[PDB]
Design a binder for this molecule. Structure first.
Ligand SMILES: [Zn+2]
Lengths: 78, 204, 60, 128, 99, 154
RNA sequence: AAGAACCUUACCAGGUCUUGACAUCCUUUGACCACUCUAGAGAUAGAGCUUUCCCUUCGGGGACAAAGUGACAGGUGGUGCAUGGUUGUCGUCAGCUCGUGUCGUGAGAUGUUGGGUUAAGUCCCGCAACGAGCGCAACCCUUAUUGUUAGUUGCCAUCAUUUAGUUGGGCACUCUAGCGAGACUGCCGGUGACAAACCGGAGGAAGGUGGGGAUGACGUCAAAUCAUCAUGCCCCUUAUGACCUGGGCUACACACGUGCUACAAUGGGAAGUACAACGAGUCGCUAGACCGCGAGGUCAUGCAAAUCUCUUAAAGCUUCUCUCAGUUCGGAUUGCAGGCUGCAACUCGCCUGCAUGAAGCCGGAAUCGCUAGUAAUCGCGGAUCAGCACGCCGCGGUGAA
């Protein structure tokens, strides 16, 4: 709902700037709950620290319509 | 709890607000300003028996007026302690500040003075019964029409609490034309906290 | 933990959406009027004292 | 000519009526009874002061009235008409007052109460 | 006529007697004054429960009746302007002259 | 209630027909305080009465409210530990009230999508003494005096 | 809890402190800063001008840093059965007491009991009681009519008008708000112990406490609140205190209390077409004009308010379509595309459009509210809010057994 530009977290943007032309690091120990995906992100693996532990997961090219907070749920109903 | 402040019942009917103001768009500043001016007075109220502080508003001159039963003990030496009050006071406000000393008379019929005096005597191992009796007898003999007094807390340094008091003179309360005074005071000896309440009536 | 959280308002916030309002003489974060900077009941207690200018009891 | 004024009040409304001899007409806010006011059939209601006082007319009406809803301000027209008919001839007062229809309804909307849901409606309360 | 004054305060007898003093100075030191026009007395409301922790079924409501006063003076002299901008007392009423 | 009797809430007749009974017919049908719709359907129902086989519709109303309106009633009482009943009298006010009550009961579900020929043919056929409401009155008279036996000694 | 992205929010997963985040005192004091960058999930470590005496009497005093130092600071950690304070309920029920006289060997009683009436210990008759006080009632506020005083930002009766009360004029009306009058069983008839009292009649705007509020005695329930505050005692006080990031606290196999919209034709859809009152406002309400089906966007206008704006009120009324169906009823759930606010609205915000179109045709045993402008229905306003309402408070329209 921000058609004046979609939003990325800036230190995560700092690390993706550090690692696009360089090689890639799977360890990204932060939240990234304020960072969407658009197709210039595919290939990185993110260990989303959901405030409890961190959840390593990579990026798909159809994992592109949305942000970076789906894959570490904080409910755990079982 | 089902009873109401008569000072709340009679404000704006037969008595007035203290901070006689009008304040459009600058109200909270003067509100907490005046509340802090109210808070500083604990140096006086320790031993000088001030009762009320009527607070006025000039152009930009700060105007209060205190009421105590000792005129000489607040003016000090020649007018040297009142100057000390102005000096410590103008640091707090930062405005043209002026204080008035209006000597209130007849301390034998108020509520805050007599009640705070007997709240002082409750600390000094005094029989509270005769304290109530001597207070109501000295209040009646200065001209009155009724006194009610009641004390609550851990009385006599003991078990489960009480709430009682003795009262003389036919005081009306549920009417309006009252001009009566209410005051609440705290006093601890060593066991928690004890409180007193006090009532008068002086015509209409 | 009130006395640190009294000072929590006395600093500037990290950004705009945290400047919450509370009472001044007490520190209740709830039910404080923004006009008088007093809470629910400290307003009520000072209202009976006849010390706030203006306010009376309302009946009609 | 001589104008016949009339005031009108009912149910949080206000009606100023100006009355004049003529053919029997009604103009409310420069409009007829069926123009400014819809379908409502208040012929006996509005012209019932013409029931016994100059039956059934015929005088003409200019009136400027606002406030409230539609029927409540129409109830204000009785005051202007019957009051003005009193102003013309005092001798019709008894025949009106035996049927009444002159005194103001002193009644309007009830003050609420806090705690209750309405002015007298209490909440549904389970026994326990 | 190039002078008009408003008095917005609380106690209406302080209000209208101070209005009477400035109308006194007006019709003494000039001419052609209008009346003391009143104004529709705006009123707010407040509402606080009668408890501390529970018991929502009993409250208490307070209010703020602010009376307002309005006075216009027609064709004055600058001498009564000197009287009006310098006379100040009482205190609980708004003191502000306008065009 | 408990101290004794009470007032009666006097009413005023119509703008046209000048009848308190039709006024009561208006104030029974009025749902949620909307008097415009009830007035429209009642005057148009009298217009439908006046078209087909009707001359004085107040009088066909009065015939209908002769032959639906009762003369007796039952009342489910109790005396000393059991639930009984008794054939009871009726005031003329409650007599008209129960007549209007039964009519507006069967004026609900005739089956016509007209909101008023159910009403019109209701009071027509009640003046013709047909439909279920006149038979409802006759069943009320039927269930009366069969319970005369176990209620004449109380 | 009158507002629950983060904060609030004490519960946790990490990463961090020890005279401390906040107070007072001694010594050096001391005019203390800010900004930029390097790096963190940040809070913070470091480098760059670095904070700079307001009376100088030849002696210092103020803004606070920062440091030594301990006095210490601090705790939403426990005890409503240790408490002050404040509050629910009996319940606006109508009782509760004292002086003098008298009776009783005394505790004590009488009064305050009997007959009538009221909302009432309200009032009458009677009786060894005669009176008084706290209560009830009244004195206060709002509303029902009218007079005076003051006529603009209000109104337009007597004149000209347009986009108009506009412009000139007027204060006639209406309205605004200070003071007044008016209603007290005051009078007629009947009933009653003639008394209290009940009903009918008059005038009157209002007749029988006009309508409505505010006002809650003696006391009961060791009722509720150490989490607003204060507060004895107990315990922590290199940690139960302190700092920050990220998450909850509506996760749900289910049961309960309160509320909203339906299950249609007294209605649904399409078009045209009238009338409120309370309030709210400068970093806010937006006039007018333009763009988009839209939510909204732009240019830009009046206003610290009887002037300007929210703000044409909804239900109304007059036509046209639908013709009793799981249906033009219903709009739950879901996809897509959008707006709005903050730093982003995927956990967890509000709204718009398009696409689907459920359960659901008045509900068992039981159960709730209500006595007249009320019940039922329909809109509107704001406290506090950045945004966030079926909740709460308040106003008004229609209006019944
Ligand atoms: Zn407070």
């Amino acid at each position: 709902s921000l058609k004046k530009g979609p939003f990325v977290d800036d230190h995560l943007m700092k690390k993706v700037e550090a690692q696009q032309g360089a090689e890639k690091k799977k360890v990204i120990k932060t939240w990234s709950r304020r960072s969407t995906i658009f197709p210039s992100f595919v290939g990185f693996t993110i260990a989303v620290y959901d405030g409890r532990k961190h959840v390593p997961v990579y990026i798909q090219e159809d994992m592109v319509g949305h942000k970076l907070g789906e894959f570490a749920p904080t409910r755990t109903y079982r | 709890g089902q009873k109401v402040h008569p000072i709340g019942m009679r404000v704006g009917i037969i008595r007035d607000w203290d901070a006689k103001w009008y304040a459009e768009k600058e109200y909270a500043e003067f509100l907490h300003e005046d509340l802090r001016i109210r808070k500083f007075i604990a140096t006086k109220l320790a031993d000088a028996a001030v009762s009320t502080i009527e607070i006025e508003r000039a152009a930009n001159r700060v105007n209060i007026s205190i009421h105590t039963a000792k005129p000489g003990m607040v003016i000090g030496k020649g007018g040297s302690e009142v100057e000390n009050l102005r000096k410590e006071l103008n640091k707090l406000t930062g405005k043209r500040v002026h204080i008035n000393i209006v000597e209130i008379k007849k301390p034998d019929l108020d509520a805050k003075l007599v009640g705070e005096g007997i709240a002082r005597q409750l600390e000094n191992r005094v029989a509270f019964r005769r304290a109530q009796k001597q207070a109501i007898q000295r209040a009646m003999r200065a001209g009155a029409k009724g006194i009610k007094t009641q004390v609550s807390g851990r009385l006599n340094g003991a078990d489960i609490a009480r709430s009682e008091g003795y009262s003389e003179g036919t005081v009306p309360l549920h009417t309006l034309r009252a001009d009566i005074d209410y005051a609440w005071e705290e006093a601890d000896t060593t066991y928690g906290k004890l409180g007193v309440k006090v009532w008068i009536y002086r015509g209409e | 933990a009130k006395k640190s959280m009294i000072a929590k308002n006395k600093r500037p916030a990290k950004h705009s959406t945290q400047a919450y309002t509370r009472c001044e003489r007490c520190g209740r974060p709830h039910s404080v009027y923004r006009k008088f900077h007093l809470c629910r009941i400290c307003f009520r207690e000072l209202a009976y004292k006849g010390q706030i200018p203006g306010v009376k009891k309302a009946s009609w | 000519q001589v104008q016949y004024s009339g005031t009108g009040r009912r149910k949080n409304a206000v009606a100023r009526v100006r009355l004049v001899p003529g053919t029997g007409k009604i103009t409310v806010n420069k409009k007829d009874v069926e123009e400014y006011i819809p379908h409502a059939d208040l012929r006996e209601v509005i012209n019932q002061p013409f029931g016994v006082t100059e039956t059934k007319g015929a005088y003409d009406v200019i009136v400027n009235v606002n406030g409230g809803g539609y029927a409540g301000q129409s109830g204000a027209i009785r005051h202007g008409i019957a009051r003005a008919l009193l102003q013309v001839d005092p001798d019709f007062r008894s025949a009106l007052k035996r049927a009444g229809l002159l005194t103001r309804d002193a009644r309007m909307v009830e003050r609420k109460k806090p705690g209750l849901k309405k002015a007298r409606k209490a909440s549904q309360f389970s026994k326990r | 006529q190039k002078i008009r004054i408003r008095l917005k305060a609380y106690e209406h007898r302080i209000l209208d007697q101070s209005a009477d003093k400035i109308v006194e100075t007006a019709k003494r030191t000039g001419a052609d004054v209008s009346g003391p026009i009143p104004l529709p007395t705006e009123r707010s409301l407040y509402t606080v429960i009668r408890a501390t922790h529970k018991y929502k079924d009993s409250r208490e409501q307070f209010e703020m009746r602010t009376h307002k006063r309005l006075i216009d003076i027609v064709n004055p002299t600058p001498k009564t302007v000197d009287a009006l901008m310098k006379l100040d007392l009482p205190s609980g009423v708004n003191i502000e002259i306008k065009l | 209630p408990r101290k004794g009797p009470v007032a009666k809430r006097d009413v005023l007749p119509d703008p046209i027909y000048n009848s308190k009974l039709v006024t009561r017919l208006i104030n029974r049908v009025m749902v949620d305080g909307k008097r415009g719709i009830a007035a429209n359907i009642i005057y148009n129902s009298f217009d439908i009465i006046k078209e087909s086989t009707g001359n004085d519709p107040l009088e066909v109303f009065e015939q209908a409210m002769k032959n639906v309106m009762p003369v007796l009633e039952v009342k489910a009482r109790r005396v000393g530990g059991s639930n009984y009943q008794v054939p009871v009298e009726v005031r003329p006010e409650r007599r008209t009230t129960l007549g209007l009550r039964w009519v507006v009961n069967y004026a609900r579900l005739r089956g016509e999508h007209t909101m008023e020929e159910r009403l019109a043919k209701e009071i027509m056929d009640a003046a013709n003494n047909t439909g279920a409401s006149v038979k409802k009155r006759e069943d009320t008279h039927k269930m009366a005096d069969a319970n005369r036996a176990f209620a004449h000694y109380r």
